[PDB]
Amino acid sequence: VEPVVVIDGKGHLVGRLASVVAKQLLNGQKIVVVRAEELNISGEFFRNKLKYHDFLRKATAFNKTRGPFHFRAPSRIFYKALRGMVSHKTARGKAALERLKVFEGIPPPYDKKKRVVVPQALRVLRLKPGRKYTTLGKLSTSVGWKYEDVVAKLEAKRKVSSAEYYAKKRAFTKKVASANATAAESDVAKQLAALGY
Template sequence: MFVINGNNHILGRLGSQIAKNLLNGEEVHIINAEGIVLTGSPETVIEKYKQRRRIKHKGRPEKSPSWPKVPQLLVRRIIRGMLPWKTLRGRESFKRLKVYMGNPKNLESQKPLENAQFKGNSRFITIGELCRNLGAKN
């Protein structure tokens, strides 16, 4: 079992390493999902995810892709995009991913992933702030 503390990790770099571990058969738990960082202008990032949530199929809106507002589900959805979701291998590996807000099970995280650490030298927004702007209640 691989436990990662999401605070101050860049989402894309963290997600690609997690996807690789999942495909290798490991179980991955992410704690503190609301502290994961998205780099870029906050206004642009918020508008991008608002637009993704607005996309609906005209004839059958219930068949449209769904993008969640809650931090742990949004992180799961983004990592799902990094897996081969339409294959059995991808779906089985996605089941081994657990994402939590905070640390509900008092899991101890291993040392942070070096190349996914956020250095703080660019504009950014956290997943928690993004979800509050999308309409999440937390």
């Protein structure tokens, strides 16, 4: 559809967001994902916290370096969910993964670009209302992630500036609609209506 698709992680379910991100790559679609700290997992926080420590104990006995690596960051928790859905040990697999970028927050370029969403992984459309679920950022911070507060600080800063942008814009688009209206009832305008516009 588009050269790059930026996805607001926020309010999406890891393995569903993953499952679509994976396919998208394999089919040639570059993707970036943002706000992975605001990503969701079904199951109450404790369940996934316990789950994560399961992951923690696995390590190469003779040398904990050769062994499974545990990344604590929300983007990186995501990427794990994703990499596992990609034949990442093949050229074609290494290729697809490189069309992928994951990020906590929304760092430059991507904050002036538009982000989309993936309804078939949106939590609010998928989870039965009532079921307990989990936020990546809180999960990660529990297993070592060092940077929740900083991301939050920078985001609130970012969210302010973007509120200016919008306001500024909603102003301009009000004028536009006004103009667009004093041209209504004209011939050109009625003709277009006829043709569905």
